[model samples]
Each structure stands twice: as structure tokens, then as C-alpha cells.
Target chain A: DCSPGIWQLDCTHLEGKVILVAVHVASGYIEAEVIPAETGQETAYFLLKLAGRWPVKTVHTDNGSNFTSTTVKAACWWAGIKQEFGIPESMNKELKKIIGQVRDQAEHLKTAVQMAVFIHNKKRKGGGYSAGERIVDIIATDIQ
Target chain B: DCSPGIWQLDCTHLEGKVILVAVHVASGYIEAEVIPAETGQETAYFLLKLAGRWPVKTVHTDNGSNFTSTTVKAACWWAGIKQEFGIPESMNKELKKIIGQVRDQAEHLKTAVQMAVFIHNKKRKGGGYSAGERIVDIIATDIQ
Candidate 1:
């Protein structure tokens, strides 16, 4: 009986770029992008995009300055979402593995990353809904 | 088919004292203690105590100076254990929850904390091993 709400935020360096990753805590759905810098403004922008896709009740992140910045704090407050500070526990290991496999072949690193995310969302475990499908189901339930 | 080698380390403030926690990655077995300071020496001493109870091949922690200190680095090298920098993911949610429940009744804060860990380890889920039993099984398998 899980819902689509909690998103864990973290950053990693890939291909010499800063990648901001937002992982839905229950569904494992990810929304990641390459950012010029790990800044508060950039994080807020990303959060806005994520909120457009799914309802965000809370955003959990490490005590990184980007997450704790005034801009992000205000944005979360404005959106009526709680912001929690904690460890960035996520399924990034599989994400990074897939990205590494497709890096040399993909025309762009961002595309490679997206493709990896696509595969992650499509792959099902133990005949459960794929990550993407789970998000859809959560959205459906939320609507009803 | 899990092993007892990976340990995740983290620190938290409880009752106005620093508590260093080492959670066995697979079994959720925990070794926690109150420390005077969050120093490399303190961390290494805690690690030694944890290793005495169970085998440790790698210790995962956040990029905190206490974990990355020269003394801790040397201690890990000396003990032939790998130190990984990453998120300090653990079953601390339940641990903290139980601690809060017993805070008022327990004679000492340390005892309250340990009782919380004990309750966390004893409670079974979905017919699986209690955390303590799982650790025993892992140790038994490792001995073979």
C-alpha cells in the first residue's frame, strides 16, 4: 500500500557533469538531469519539473547546501511540500551501471542517461509493475 | 545467501551526546555506542568493537571528516578493510522510533537506545529471520 510522494534527491558526477537525481522513494521512479552546477536555483528548477509529473508530498535529501539553500526551502514551502534532511538512499547503482554500458554508443551523455532511466522504469521485478507502470498506477489511484 | 562483511557507518546526536552507529548491511545487525566526540579515533575504535563481534570487509560512510580522517584511514588499512564513501543508509528509522518510545521509562539513555536496537532486531517480518538470528546464520555460513 505505497503511494507516489516521497522523493529522495542526490547528485553524482558522470562524464564530467553534475547529474542531479531525484528518486521516488516507493516506486523507484527517477527523474534525473545534468545540471551546470549543484546550486539551489538549479535544484528548485528540477523540483518544479518533477512536481509537474507527480504530486510531491516530501523531498528528502542530504544536508548538502544545494538542498538546504534558501531557494529550495522556499520553493518547497510554496508548493506545500515538506523537506527532510537525511542520507541520500537510492537505486543509483543500477542507474550508473546502465549508463556506463551505453555511454560509448549513445550520441549524447544525457541521452545515454535517459535511456538508462527508461530501461530502469520498464524492467519489472517478480512480475510486479515496472517502475513507470507503478507510477501510473499510483497516479490512477490518487485520481480516484 | 548474504554475507556479513559490509557495514554502514553513521553518527547522530541523541540526548546531547554523539552516538556512532554501525549497521551490518545485510542482516541489519547494529553496533552503536555513545562517543565523546565524532572523531576519526572514535570511529576507528567503534569499528574495532564492531569487527570483534562480526567480520568486516568494507565500511561505507558519508564523506564526513570523522570517517575520512587520517587515523580512520590508517586503521582501515591496517585491518585490511575497504572504506567506501557514500550514503550512510541503514534501518535507523525503526531504531529511532523505538528509542523515542522508551526514552521516558528507561533508566539510562544508553540502555534505552540498546533496548530499542534489541526490539528492532527481535521483531520478524514476513516469516524472515529476526535480525539477530540472521546475523547468527550469516556467521554460521561464514564459518563453513
Candidate 2:
């Protein structure tokens, strides 16, 4: 019944590092990060960064120790955010899809993930608007 | 590294209803419930009830659709609780183990779960104290 406050969060591995991806379920907006390892400290750091940029009401992630660590839990507790557990299969699929199409030979995995997120957000057609377009609309409307 | 503010939350089916189980990672304290179905509403309702009885810092569960639903997300939001995703395999093993030993025919599933929780909590030897004993010590220490 509520609107776009819930987001799905997951992590993927590439080149021995972690690519944390977040998708706003309502607007399809995406955020991606490449971190050293999938640990609680790393997850908490990224969560703090994401919270600074977006209004996070809820976060959904699968039962990885990185997401379930005491560090991440304390961060969420201090930040006043709720957590959810599940696989964001569709968006992860799209992310994987876009990553496969990008140039990986020359660019780093971070660059590849960056490109994937951008292309996925800026290109997909949705209800007369792309994800990037809808992101702006939602942000702009929330400001007023 | 830290002690038991982290609890694992999960649900299992028994005779057409859902039995939600929460286990404290550090103290091995357990809380269980029998709910209507594996929906977000049912999950959230049970969570709120558990939170009222215990000090919940973080909850870990697998990526079940019910655990990840929006209804549960919002409930966690207002409760100032963090969430984690992972399987509590060891404790769940003991729970299932004890449930098998109980006389489930003459009693309800709720009764069986209650007995399982009680037996699991009161009997298992941990160091010098049982889980139930440690639970009392933790609560007593927190009060002082």
C-alpha cells in the first residue's frame, strides 16, 4: 500500500571483489558499489554511503553474513532503517544482463558495474519513462 | 565477535500453519510462534509480539518471500530493528529434532513447538549453564 520507500539490496562478485547493488523497487532506480570483501564492516560502510544519498526506508538482502553481521545491524539500528531478506532476482538478472554487454577487457570490474547500472537505469522503457527518467520524477516530486 | 544482540528469525510449516522461530545467537535463547500463514502480515505481527517480550537488535532469516514482504519491512521500520538474512541451521536442527520426539498427535502443533522450544532451551548444556539459565543471567545482568 505504501509508495517508493522500500529498496532491494544484494551483492555480486566480480574479479575477487564484491559489487553491491541496490534497486528502488518502485522507480527502478539503481545504485552499485564495488568493495573489497563481503563483510559486515564493508556492508555497513556502503549502507551509510547509500543512506547519505537516498531516503532508505527498508532494505532487502539475502541471508549472507555480510548483511547479517553485528556491524551492519548496528548501522541499521542507528540509521533508523528497517531490513528485509529476499533475493532481488529480477533486477539482479537485469544487472547481470547489462554487465555481460559491457566492455570488461579494458575496464575494471567497478567500471563494468558502473556501466551496467547506468545502462540499465537510463535505457529500460517503463510506463512511458526509463528508470533514470522516473528517478528524476520521483526525486523532483518529493522535493515539493 | 560481539555477543548476542543478533537473533535469527525463520518460519516452518506445521499442520497447515506457520511456526515462526527466533533464536538468540549468543545466549541461545529461543522464541517461537504459530501463525496463520507465511505472509508479511503474519510475520510482522509475530515480530511485534516478540519484540514486546524481548530486546531485539537484529533479526536474521533466509530469503523467504514472507520475510521480505513490504508489510514486514514497514513493521521493522517503526520498531527500530535491523534485519539479517541467513539460516539458523544448528538451532533449527535441534528444534526439529525435539519436535520429532514430542507426542504431536494428542497435542496441537503449537503445543509441540512450545514443548520443543522449552525443551531445547532448558536442556541443552552450554558450558556450565543451559540456554534457559544463560537467558536469565543475561537479563539479570542487563537490569543492573
Candidate 3:
């Protein structure tokens, strides 16, 4: 079984788009924030605040150059957060299943899925609902 | 383009069971058979038969205990098959994609998906056909 709070970051393929995603590993709850690529530093600061809000024990990310940059490392260190590196090949799985969903939705809607994630995280108590409970809730809400 | 008469091992997770796979690298065709796990002598004999059936130049596998054993190395050397050790990360990705799909189908069918691998492989290949002609033939099969 996975831990209660585990977060992962994935780089956006779209040009000029910045995305930060966090997932609760055990419950599969997801949260996301989107920012313009121009404001990477601001986005990093925002992410630090978000992490502080959630208080995760460890965060996982792929070995992307930007994610591993000295600036990002400094930001993480300042935030007092531990960073974990995932094997590159296995990184896609986590990114696709959690963060990819947000990207996909955002692509389809021509809008950021950040609001949906916000709604989801808020309603489900930091997005920590069981799979069964999630299904029931989705059905009840008729999200699809 | 892929070559003709290439072999593929049906390594769709036949661990612990009584089968081994050897494939021709250029062609995606495969030969599979059951073998008892025992001494190098038995393994060598079985490999000989496999080699006789198809001209295999290379074998790829993860760091399984059996594959890493001295006996297996000796057998591969004697058989003149080049051994390739897959990186753990690459193997993990393959498992995530192939095994994940298999598990999804198994969950839907409420049965073990291992039994369906052969058929599933065939069906997936069939689905790759373009305009009623097999895509593999277009790419790999030599025109008479």
C-alpha cells in the first residue's frame, strides 16, 4: 500500500505552459496548479506554499534538468522539503495516471483543470478518498 | 523497417511457470516452449532445440536470478546467443504498460490475464492491420 501523502512533478510538453501536480499516493487524490512558463520562479514559490499547506513528507519527480536545477533545489531546500527521484522509465506511469489526466482535461476544455482539481481536493478532504468512495462520488456528481 | 523471419519471445510474464521464450530480433515472430528448471545441461539442451527452430542472435531479459546464474550464462555462450541485460527502469516501464493493460482486462473479466496473453498478443497485432493488410507485412515482409 502507498503512503498517505506523496507528491510528484511532471514537466509540461505544451509550449509556454507550466504545470505542477501533487497526488496522494494511498488515496489517489490529485491537486494541480498551472502557471505561465514566464513565471517559473513565481510558480516555484507558489508550489512551496502549496506544499506547506499540504505538509507532505516526501516528493517524487523525474530527473528533468529544470526540476533538478540549482534554483529548484534551492527553492526546495528553503521550503524544508525532501525531494525523491524516480527512475525515468517508471516516471511516465505516475505522470500519466495523475498529472496527465489534468493535462488531458485542460487540453479538451481549453482551460486549466486547476479549478477542477481545486474542487476535487476541497470536496474530498485533500483528495484522500478511497477508490470506491471516489467512484460513488463521481457517479453522484455526474462529473462525466 | 523490421526484417523478415524475426522471432519474438512470448515473455508475457511466464515466470514461475514452465516456459521460456526466444525470439529473432529482426522479425517479431516468436517461438515458445516449456522447459524444466534444472541443471545447465537441461537448459542447454532446450536452448539447442530452440536455436534449431529459429536463428536467434540476441536475448534480452531483466536481472532475474535464473538469467543471472552462471549456468544460464554458460548455456547462452555455448549456444552463441548474445545476452543483453535490460535496465531495471526500462523493464519497469514495459511491465507498467503491458502488465498494467493485462491486469485491467483481467479485472474486467474477473479471471487471470496470464492465460490470455497469447491471444491478446495476436489480437493486438491484428488490430494493427492497415486497410486489411497486416502492418507488419507492409513494414517487414519482403515482396516476392
Candidate 4:
């Protein structure tokens, strides 16, 4: 009757890609994908993919144009992903800063973002435990 | 009896530089400057310079954080530059597109952007006249 899966989605753009990110609020776990261009449907595809891996009971987005479109809404509905148009949050800022910093060394954006997400997830502390530990354990124990 | 100057401002970042811009809507004249970083005050200084050259009505912007901050607001107030929290327009897109197309060419981004604005102003039309014609004439007529 309540909630367990509340995910936050955000995006940032760079020279060659528009990056999409999803974070599990309960576990501090993260997932990301980069789009070649910022078409309106870019984030929805990733959100759907994220749902395939996790129990997405609610989705909170920062009201970016891509995430708020009718196409994305329809897709979310079809996937049973609850869309939450909520206030922006900070893991987004911190994550993008990592990606933006990598621009100084060029040509390895995808690798850099992936590494950032990996390290962040491994280091994140929520529920007084590591996201890697808590996320997997939480998803494993409660998801199915 | 109460009105302010009209200008449209936008900013973009590349290679650690924040490029700022202002456009005169009626005649399509453009003025731009680039700063080393994305400070909240970057465009205000350039907008001041633009005011020295022309009549600023209201500045149309997409309401980026920098443009909406207190310092920027005070600066615009001082310069008589009206801040219109309006929609994002095409000049930014066209300007970036010019810089973007030159990515494969691998060279002078600043020069390419300058040429893009110059050509764009020279290409625009009003009253069956080019912006180069309309803008220069507009400036000359208003220059007291």
C-alpha cells in the first residue's frame, strides 16, 4: 500500500551526448545512459530500461522537456512506472560535475561517466551502509 | 511611461569558456563576449556594453540560474535592460549549430561563432531588407 521503489531521473548535455541518469532513492544506487541527441523521447527509453532491472514504483524527474513529453508519459504508463514531477535534487549535480570535469581530458566521455557512476555507487552512504551493499541487498530481499 | 530595453541573452560553455550573447530582436543585430568560466555575472557586463551601443527593450532568456540571480537582476535594473523571462529562441541554437558543424573541421571555435553571428545578422530580413541593412540603419538613426 505504500512505496519502496522511488527513482529519480535527470539529464545533462555535452558536446556529443545527452546523458540520462536514474538513482534509487532508497538505496542510493545509480544507472546512466547517454543519448546521441536530445530528442524528446531520449530519457524515456532509458527509464524503461531501468525499470526492467529494478522495481520502479515511482519516477521523479526535474521537469526537463524530454522527460515531460507525451511520448515519455505514454511509455511510462505502459511500463507502469509512476512519474513524479518533483523538485530537483543534488546527486544529479554531483554526478554531472564528474562528467563535466572529464571534458578537460576529452574523447573518453562514456568511460568517464561509467566510472563515475561505479565509484559513486560504491561509495554512497545511505541507511548507514554502502549503496553497493544496501542496494543489492534491498533489491534482492524486497524486489521479487 | 514605463518600459525597459529589449535584448535576448543566452550563454554556452566549451573548452572551459562561457560564451555570452545578446541580440536586438527587431533588427537582428548581435553582440557577444566570452568569459573563462560560467560565473553568474558573465552576461551582465556584456549586456552593459551592448546598452552603450543601442536601445535595450527587454532581455528574453530561458531563465537560467545565472540570469535569475539577484546580482544579475540588479545589474539589469541599473542598465535599464528589462529582463523578460521568456522562452528560449533560435539564435542560440543557430550559433551553436555553426560551432557544432565545425567540430569535424577541428579549429577556431571563437572565430567560427563570430563569423556565424556576422553572417546571421547579414542574412536576416525585415521590411524586405537585410539585418545588416536594418540593424546598421537602426543604430545610426537612434545614435544621438
Runs in model 1 lying further than 4 Å from the true structure: A1-3, A85-88, B1-144
What is the CAPRI rating of model 4's predicted complex?
incorrect
Give the per-residue Cα lDDT of candidate 2 at B85: 49
Pitting candidate 2 against candidate 3, the one with the higher TM-score is 2
TM-scores for all candidates?
A: 0.47, 0.45, 0.33, 0.43
lDDT by residue (tens digit), candidate 1, B1-144: 444678788888877888777777778767566667778777765564444334578888654566677767755764567876444343667677888997875455665665466566656767665665566556545544
Off by over 4 Å in 3: A14-16, A38-43, A85-111, A118-144, B1-144
Residue lDDT tens for model 3, B25-108: 443333333444544444444454444222345655432454555655655665566655432313223323444565543332
Q: Please tell me which model should have the higher lDDT, number 1 or number 4.
A: 1
Cα deviation at A107, candidate 4, in Å, is: 2.5
**Interface RMSD computed for candidate 3 is what?**
25.8
**Candidate 4 Cα RMSD after full superposition onto the native fold (Å):** 22.4
- Please give, for residues A56-132, the per-residue lDDT of candidate 2 as tens digits: 77887665555668778866775567886533458877787787887552246665665566567656473466665
* Stronger candidate by TM-score (1 vs 3): 1
Q: Of the pair 3 and 4, which is ahead by lDDT?
A: 4
Q: With candidate 1 superimposed using the best TM-score fit, by how many Å does residue A31's alpha carbon deviate from the native?
A: 1.1
Give the 10-residue window scoring lowest on summed lDDT in candidate 3 chain A. Answer: A135-144
Indicate which candidate wins on TM-score.
Answer: 1
Candidate 1 lDDT by residue in tens digits, A1-144: 544578888888886788888888777777677777678877865665455334678888764566678767755765567876433444777799988986874455665675566667657777565665565555445544
